[PDB]
Structures are given as structure tokens and as C-alpha cells.
Scaffold this motif. Structure first.
Motif, short mmCIF file in Angstrom:
data_model
loop_
_atom_site.label_atom_id
_atom_site.label_comp_id
_atom_site.label_asym_id
_atom_site.label_seq_id
_atom_site.Cartn_x
_atom_site.Cartn_y
_atom_site.Cartn_z
N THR A 512 0.80 -1.21 0.00
CA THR A 512 0.00 0.00 0.00
C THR A 512 0.84 1.27 0.00
N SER A 513 2.13 1.17 -0.30
CA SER A 513 3.02 2.31 -0.14
C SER A 513 2.79 3.38 -1.21
N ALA A 514 2.36 2.98 -2.40
CA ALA A 514 2.12 3.93 -3.47
C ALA A 514 0.64 4.19 -3.70
N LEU A 515 -0.23 3.66 -2.85
CA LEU A 515 -1.67 3.80 -3.02
C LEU A 515 -2.20 4.92 -2.14
N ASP A 516 -3.39 5.40 -2.49
CA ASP A 516 -4.04 6.43 -1.70
C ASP A 516 -4.73 5.80 -0.49
N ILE A 523 -8.47 -1.95 0.57
CA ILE A 523 -7.71 -3.14 0.22
C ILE A 523 -7.27 -3.91 1.46
N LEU A 524 -7.25 -3.26 2.64
CA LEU A 524 -6.84 -3.98 3.84
C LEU A 524 -7.83 -5.07 4.24
N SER A 525 -9.12 -4.81 4.01
CA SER A 525 -10.14 -5.83 4.25
C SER A 525 -9.94 -7.02 3.32
N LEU A 543 1.89 2.65 9.84
CA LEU A 543 1.68 1.70 10.93
C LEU A 543 0.21 1.43 11.21
N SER A 544 -0.65 2.43 10.97
CA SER A 544 -2.09 2.25 11.12
C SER A 544 -2.60 1.15 10.21
N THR A 545 -2.07 1.08 8.98
CA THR A 545 -2.41 0.02 8.05
C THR A 545 -1.98 -1.35 8.53
#
Lengths: 589, 589
Positions: A512-516, A523-525, A543-545
């Protein structure tokens, strides 16, 4: 870089000792070569016998029969000569193509089996241009060397010996002197012509560049009334280019003048000698037309020699390059008698693992941990701890300097590479797509990937609605030279690729580093949905992700710095809490 | 698009009626053509006389003398034929180059004299590619049409008439049937070969693209163990390309087979006929070797006809394109008997001026004002009032729809374009540089721009320190294919260009719109320095940068909305004050 050892290495690729149609084709090729040159040298003999039978008809009254027969034999022999030359091309071209195709296939296979630091030391564009240059130059070099040099040297030696017979030594030394001086002046004046052509080419490029720039700055050119200035500039460039082209055509004219001069001097000398030999009664009238057709058929294919040397040097260079890419060994290899990696409990352990990309800067120092099977583990750190290398060292792209990584208590440095890369899965930070359809990209994860597995992954990544919204559905051409896709879509494609692969162990290398933030929260779900029953390792930046993981291991300068749950680290109030408040303030700002 | 009218238009460009060396060169060229074909057809006659004199030596005892003379004449005639062909190339190539050079110069001149909306409707890359395609295709078309078709048709008709003499009608109809069937099968099989070559080319491109993409995605290819998959894919593409190449070489082989077959059938028929005619005593032995050298010298240059039709069609297309670019007239033109614009008091007045770029959207509606000479006047407005067009309509790039712009009380639509563009100066919003040195860019403003004026502008723009800091100084290569310069540097270059031009009237068309605030605050003092004694018109976007002007005229939808000094408008508290507070808050944010 020697022609002997280089072509001796190439010789099994032409003569395989394994394909009987190939060896039959190459022996038919040289058979057609020798047959064509034989009938070409044998026809003017029949022409001379025809003229002799027509001129000595005091003894041979059916000169109708004899002359007609020898003349029809002459015409059929000419046709048969050209017939055999085109037949040798027809039989030989498939041989040449299959030789260069097998060489290109082998360098491609060795290239893809080669290790990752080769693809970082050089550029893939350089590699593909050197292999396409190789196959083109090797094809044209093989064709030129086998289809001009050998037939012309056979024809030349046979003409020399056929003038050694039936004539004196003077014709032989005259012909060989003409051949030597011919090829000498051709080589010199062709080198001069190539020099002039290079100068003409770069002058042409300068003239065209001046033209297009003067057109493109049209507004300023109107702003200062410099139309006459730019016209004079363009005229000067075009004039210099025209003079260079005139000098190039002068070089070609002098080439043709020298060649025609020397061949006509030889023809005049030979014909004067044979008409004198007729005058003193030794030689018949057929010897005139004999040497007449011999010289005009001889001196035509001799022009190629200067460019032949250049092309065979270039082919030698390219074949040496392809052979060097063959003999370049791999850095990382499987052990001899490598047992298969067997997984019953997909457990990871890092053990005192030492790594850097290069030996003068050690990045990985003291990592030693255990990742239990079925858990959700997390890696995080600063930009300078170097967290990105963990996936590359887990896939055995590089071996560690010291220490060991065991999967299921087994050394991944000691198992089969294909089984190790089979049991793993990865979402890369940068997703890439092949210039193909999207359905092939989804089915890319497994070699025999079924369509049921394809739409299973498409629903599992929650992209089946996106494949329904596409006009061609699964058969939509995507990527470059196709429809571009957004970043979250590409990550969902990568997730579907990993689900087609179906490993027990998967990794998120900064997924997820380049995603909004919106695509992130969507996408985390999905990532938790794939994280049902697999051993999941996640390396993240925000870190929240990764705030929901079972445990977090925080790395610092190649050391396992911190370890524990999110509540434990936010209660310990250390570097984790500092980074957490840093990310909170950086998101608030 | 007809060959008659097209080449009749081209005919003065080859035959100028103005350059005597050109007309002498072209008449020498056709003289060399006719002389070369004449000696080429005339030599085998002497060869036949030689063989006849050698075979009928019962009546001619000095057969030494006669045969030796005719044979040496034969050899010298062969050399003279090739000599005259290369001489016609030498004399004619400069003619061809000067014809295409004059055509390219004229289309370049008409192109630069053409109006601005032509360069906006089409692209300059399209124009320069069509003119370079034009000059290449016209050169090769002129060379092919004048140096193969005319000599081969002269040689063919002379061979036909020379067989009409000395032989019966049967040889004539046999030769003409062979020529017809030859060119027919050549045209058909060459069209088939071109079809196969196109298919082979696109298949080759597909194979190479698959190769480079499979190499570039090396990381994912390692991530899924698909090396065997990609090797099989590359092998399949290379195999299909190899089969296409084999079919192309099969087409070329069948071409050579058909050509050699038909020419050898004709040679067999002709030689059988002449040996029968010898047998019934009509024909001597020289007629055999006569027709023998005739056919082998005849049938060689006839192969080019199919590609000649294609190249002459392409040359016709390109010459029609260049002629269309010639006959495209200019939209804006000077009036017949245009008087010179004379300036004693550089005053501007706009008068009810109506303009839009296109007739369906009027942008300029009701502007009518007077700009006094020596003052500092200012134009500003929103993004939708359209302030950018004022410089383009002042330079007479477009004429107004209605209304008039007078300079010094004189209609700029009624004066000479060069004097109008001489009395003006402009700093563009986007500065552009020629791919050349910086000193030539500074000296670009005037045609005979002196070096004293160059460093005068370099100190006047305060760029002389920047030219001192450069390694090559004024002779530093700049722009593209040179050292890139920053935006404020480029604007200073533009200021120096305008100071080399030295007009009484200058304009700032958003001179600081793309610059930063520091370069802006540095450059406004410089702009006031050039604004000593000239009539200065400034159009800006940031009102603070124009807060120092004598007066501001604010435009709205093609109407002179507001007018007055900065204190007067910030006291009137209207749209000016609203835009001012808007810019203040947008700069504070």
C-alpha cells in the motif's frame, strides 16, 4: 575472439548430430553448391565444341545434329546453373534460420536462468538489442560466408586450372594478376567510399535538424524578421550536404571505372593472344568464344570481398558476445542432489542472517526470529533500516553472507529453487503487467491455470465486478499497448495472481506504499480476506495500516530491535509510539 | 494528381532557362546516355565481323589484322559503354541534387511566409517529415525514371529493330513475347513477395517485443517460476518468424527461377534457329555469337519495372504534396503598394477592434483606447477575459474582424509587415532558444547584430555576469543538445534579444507568469531599466508585479472594463480590489 574456436563452437549448432533432416538438408545444400558451379563451368566447353563443329564441317556433315545438340546443351546448362543456385538457397535458408533460432533460444534460456545482479549491472534494453543484433548479423554472416566465398573460390580455382590446361602459363598469370589488382583497388576505394558516406550522413543529420528547429521556433522567427537569415542557413546546410552526396557518387563512379578498366584490359589481352594462337594454327576458333564467355562470367561476383571481411568480423563479434552470455555462470545455484522442500507446518525462522547487496556495506546484521504458521506477522522500520530486502532474501534471490533462513526447519539454501518459489507468494510494491490480456495476467500465477481458478481469484480479490465492467471482460488487452489500469486495480490483479498460485506463505512487500488512503482502506479488508488460513508476513510503511496485526517486529540497522503486539508497543511508548505520533502528525498536516 | 501536369510543373525546376551550366549539364547527360547505349549496341556487330573474318580466311589472308582490329574494337567498346554510363551518372547527379534543392528551398520559403493558423492546424513534425520524404522520393524517382526506363526502352527498341533487320519476323515476335511474359511474371511474383515481406516484418516485431518484455519483467518471472513458459513463448514467436522468412526466400527463389527459365528458352530457340539458318547456307557463323551476346546483355536490366511503377507513384504523390504546399496562399498579406510604417511618436490606438481566433466564438468585442508614447501601460484581467491575444493581434499575426489598430495614427493593416514587425518588441510568456550558442541567440534580434550590441544587451539585461560565469562565455552551446538554462536566465536572454532589436515599443506578454517570486522581484527592476524611454505595454497576471504602472486597463470579455491608476482603482474598491485581495490571500495561503 578467434574465428577457429568461435566457429568450432558454432559447428554443433549447425551440425547437430541429432536431427537427420538437418544433416540431410546441409549435405543437400553443399551438393547443390557444387552441382551449380560444376554445370556453370561445364557449359562453355559445350559451346566451344558447338562452334568447332560448325566451323570444321568439311569432316562432319551432320553439323545440324552436332551443333544443335551442343547448343541446346549450352542453353539448358545455363538454366540448370541458375536453377541449382536458387535450389541451394531454398534448401539452405531453413538450416540457417534454425541454427540462429537455436542459438537465440539457448542464450534466452541461460539469460533467464541467470541471477538478479546481472540484470541490475546491465540494462535489459542493452541485452535485447545485443541479441537481436546477434541474430541478424549471424544470419547475414552465415549466408554471405557460405554462399559467396566458397562458390567464388571454387569457380576461381577451377578457372585457373582450366586455363592451366588448354593454354600456356601466360594466361594464368595474367588472370591472377587481374584478380589480385581488382580486389586490391576494390578494397581501397570502398574504404574511401565508406569514409565519404559517414561524412555525408552526419552532414545530412545536421541539415535536417536545422530545418526542423527553424520551423518549430516560428513565433520568435516572426518576432525578429529573420526569415531571410534562416533561409540562408538552411540553404547553406543543404548545399554542404549536396556536395557530400556528389563526392559519394564520385567514389562509386571511380569504383565502377576501375573495375571495368581492369576487366576489359584482361579481355583484350586474352582475346589477342588466342587470335594469334589461331593465326599460327595451334588454336581453333572456339577458343575465342571460350575465353570470351569465361571472363564475363568470372569477374562479376568478385566485388563483395571488402564488405565480406567487415561482415564476418561483425558476425564474429556478435557470436562471441552470445557465447559469452552462454558461458556466464549463475551466482546462486541449487545444491547437487537438492531435496525438495516439503511443507507440513509453514514456519519461518531467520537465524543470525547477514546480508548486504554489496560487500562494502552490510545492511542485515543480527536478525533471528521465528514466524509461526498461520499467524499474521509484521515488519516495520525507518527508511534507513532497510526493510525492503527481506522478501528478496526470502525468495533466495541472493544468498545471505552468514546465517540461515529455514522454512519448516529446512534450509532454503539447500532445497530446490522451484519448490521454494512454489511454496511462496508475494505482492510487490510496484505491480507490473504483461502487454497482453488481463485474463492471461490473472492466469499467470500457475502454468496450467484453469478458468475456474481465474474467476475464483477474481471474486477472491473482489475484482469480478471490474471484469464485468470491462467491454471485453477477461479478454481485455491491458497494460502498455492496451488499456491502462489504476494502482488499486493493479494491486487487486496481483492479489488474484497470488491466489491463483495459492501458497501457504504470502508476503506484502509495501503493498500500500504507493496507493491512496481510500484504496488502502478498501484493500486492507481484502488482505485480511486472503489472510484466512495462510502464514502471512506483511512489511508496511504506515503503521495504522498494520495496526491490526498479531505482532510487529521492528527492525533497525539489520537488528531485530523491537517485538510485540501493538498494545504492548504503544504501552512501551518507545520508538514505535514516536513513529506512530510522527505518522499521525504527518497525516494531520 | 496527374503525371503530365505534375511533371510539367516540375520541368522549369530542371530546365531553368537561367543557368547555362545547368542546361549544358542536362544536355551532356542525355548525350552521354545516347552515346553509351549506342556503343553498347554497336560493339557485338564488330564482334560478329571479327568471327566472320576469322572463319572466311580463304579470301582474307591478313586475318591477323582484320580479326585483331575488330576484336580490340570490341573490348574498347565494352569499356567505353561502362565509361559512358558512369559519366552520365557523374554529370547528372549534381543536376538532380540542385533540382530537388531548389524545390525544397522554395517550399521552405513559402512555408515560412505562410500564416500562423497553418502552423496550428497541422504539426511541424508532420511538415518536416513530408518535406524530407519529398526530397528523398523525388531524388530517387528522378534517378530511376531518367536512368533506367529511357535507356532500357531505347536498348529494347533498338534490339527489336536490329533483329527486324538481318533476321526474319519470327525472332522479333519470339523476343517480344519473351519480354512481355518476363515483365508480367516479374510484376505478379514481386507483388506476392511484397505481401509476404510485410507479414514477415510484423511477425518479427511481435517476436522482438515478446522478448524484451519477458526480459524486463524478470523479477515477477522469477517470482512465479515461469522461465519454461516464457522460453516456450519466445520459441513459438521465433519459429513463426523463421517460417515467414523461409517463405520470403521461397518467393525470391521462384522469381529467379522464372526469369532464368524464360530467358534460357528464348536463347535456345534463337540459337537453334540461327544454326539451322547456317545449315541452309543463309547465315554465317558470326550470327550465332551475335544473338548469343545480344540476349545475355539484353535481359539483365528489365527486372526493375514493378518497383519502378511503385516508386514513380510515390514520387508523384510527394511532388504533388510539395506543389500543394507551394500553391497554398497566405491568409494575411500586405496591401499592394504598401507604404512603410513611419514612427515619430510611438502611439498606439485600438479602435472598436473585433477579434476571435475562430468565427464561432468572438473573444474581442469592444476595445478602443489610446496608449501614449513613452508611458507605461498595463493590461490585466481574469483567465476568461482572454488577455493573451493582444500581442498576437498587435504583431498582425491575425487581422481583426472589425475595427482597426493604428500605430502613430497609421493603420498597421495597411503598412509593410517587415517595418511593423521592426518597430515592435516582445517578451513571450514561454521563452524558446535555438539549438546553437548563446551568443547567436543574443545576436538573433538583428540580422547584422554586432558584438558591441551583443555585450551592450548582455549588460543591459544584467546577464553579463552569467556570460562571464560560463566556461565558453558567449560561445557556450545552449538549449537542446546543449546546456539547459533556467527560466529567469531565459527571460534575461529574451530581454537581451529585444534590446538588440531596440524598438520604441515593447510588450511583456506574461513575462513573469511562469517564474518564481525571487526571479520576479529581481526581473521587475530590469524591466523598469529597459522601460527608460520606450513605449512599454505590459500584460501580467499578478497585480503586485504591475502595481507600479502609470495606468492599468482592465479587460473583461473583450470590453475595456476598467481604466485608471492603481491608487484610483484600489480606491474605487471594485473588481480590481477583489482580484487584489484574492491574490493577497492566494499568496498568503
Amino acid at each position: 575472439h578467434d574465428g577457429w574456436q568461435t566457429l568450432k563452437r558454432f559447428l554443433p549448432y549447425l551440425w547437430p548430430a541429432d536431427n537427420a533432416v538437418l544433416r540431410r538438408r546441409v549435405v543437400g545444400a553443399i551438393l547443390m553448391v557444387l552441382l551449380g558451379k560444376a554445370t556453370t563451368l561445364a557449359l562453355p566447353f559445350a559451346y566451344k565444341k558447338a562452334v568447332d563443329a560448325m566451323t570444321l564441317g568439311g569432316g562432319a556433315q551432320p553439323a545440324l545434329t552436332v551443333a544443335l545438340a551442343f547448343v541446346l546443351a549450352y542453353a539448358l546448362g545455363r538454366f540448370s546453373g541458375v536453377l541449382f543456385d536458387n535450389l541451394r538457397n531454398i534448401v539452405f535458408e531453413r538450416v540457417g534460420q534454425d541454427a540462429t533460432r537455436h542459438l537465440a533460444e539457448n542464450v534466452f534460456a541461460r539469460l533467464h536462468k541467470l541471477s538478479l545482479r546481472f540484470h541490475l549491472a546491465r540494462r535489459t534494453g542493452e541485452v535485447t538489442k545485443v541479441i537481436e543484433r546477434g541474430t541478424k548479423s549471424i544470419d547475414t554472416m552465415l549466408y554471405f560466408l557460405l554462399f559467396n566465398i566458397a562458390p567464388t573460390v571454387i569457380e576461381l580455382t577451377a578457372v585457373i586450372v582450366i586455363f592451366w590446361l588448354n593454354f600456356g602459363l601466360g594466361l594464368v598469370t595474367a588472370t591472377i594478376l587481374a584478380v589480385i589488382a581488382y580486389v586490391w583497388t576494390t578494397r581501397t576505394i570502398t574504404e574511401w567510399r565508406t569514409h565519404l558516406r559517414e561524412k555525408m550522413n552526419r552532414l545530412d543529420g545536421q541539415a535536417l535538424a536545422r530545418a526542423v528547429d527553424s520551423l518549430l521556433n516560428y513565433e520568435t522567427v516572426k518576432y525578429f524578421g529573420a526569415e531571410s537569415r534562416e533561409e540562408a542557413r538552411y540553404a547553406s546546410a543543404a548545399r554542404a550536404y549536396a556536395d557530400a552526396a556528389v563526392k559519394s557518387e564520385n567514389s562509386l563512379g571511380l569504383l565502377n571505372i576501375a573495375q571495368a578498366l581492369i576487366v576489359n584490359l584482361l579481355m583484350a589481352g586474352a582475346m589477342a593472344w588466342t587470335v594469334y594462337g589461331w593465326s599460327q594454327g595451334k588454336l581453333t576458333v572456339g577458343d575465342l568464344v571460350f575465353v570470351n564467355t569465361y571472363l564475363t562470367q568470372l569477374f562479376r561476383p568478385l566485388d563483395m570481398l571488402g564488405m565480406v571481411y567487415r561482415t564476418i568480423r561483425q558476425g564474429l563479434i556478435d557470436m562471441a558476445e552470445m557465447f559469452r552470455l552462454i558461458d556466464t555462470h549463475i551466482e546462486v545455484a541449487d545444491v547437487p542432489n537438492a531435496p525438495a522442500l516439503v511443507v507440513n507446518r509453514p514456519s519461518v525462522t531467520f537465524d543470525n542472517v547477514v546480508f548486504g547487496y554489496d560487500r562494502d556495506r552490510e545492511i542485515l546484521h543480527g536478525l533471528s526470529f521465528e514466524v509461526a504458521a498461520g499467524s499474521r506477522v509484521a515488519i516495520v522500520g525507518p527508511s534507513g533500516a532497510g526493510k525492503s530486502t527481506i522478501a528478496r532474501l526470502l525468495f533466495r534471490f541472493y544468498d545471505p553472507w552468514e546465517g540461515r533462513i529455514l522454512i519448516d526447519g529446512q534450509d532454503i539454501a539447500h532445497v530446490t529453487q522451484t519448490s521454494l518459489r512454489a511454496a511462496l507468494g508475494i505482492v510487490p510494491q510496484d505491480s507490473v503487467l504483461f502487454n497482453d490480456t488481463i485474463g492471461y495476467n490473472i492466469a499467470y500465477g500457475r502454468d496450467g491455470a484453469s478458468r475456474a481458478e481465474v474467476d475464483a481469484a477474481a471474486k477472491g480479490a473482489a475484482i469480478a465486478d471490474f471484469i464485468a465492467r470491462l467491454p471485453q471482460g477477461y479478454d481485455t488487452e491491458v497494460g502498455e499497448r492496451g488499456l491502462k489500469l489504476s494502482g488499486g486495480e493493479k494491486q487487486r490483479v496481483a492479489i488474484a495472481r497470488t491466489l491463483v498460485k495459492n501458497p501457504p506463505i504470502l508476503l506484502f512487500d509495501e503493498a500500500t506504499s504507493a496507493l491512496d488512503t481510500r484504496t488502502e482502506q478498501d484493500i486492507l479488508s481484502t488482505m485480511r480476506a486472503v489472510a484466512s488460513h495462510r502464514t502471512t508476513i506483511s512489511i508496511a510503511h504506515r503503521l495504522s495500516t498494520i495496526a491490526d496485526s498479531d505482532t510487529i517486529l521492528v527492525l533497525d540497522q539489520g537488528r531485530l530491535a523491537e517485538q510485540g503486539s501493538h498494545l504492548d508497543l504503544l504501552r512501551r511508548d518507545g520508538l514505535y509510539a514516536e513513529m506512530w505520533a510522527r505518522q499521525a502528525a504527518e497525516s494531520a498536516e
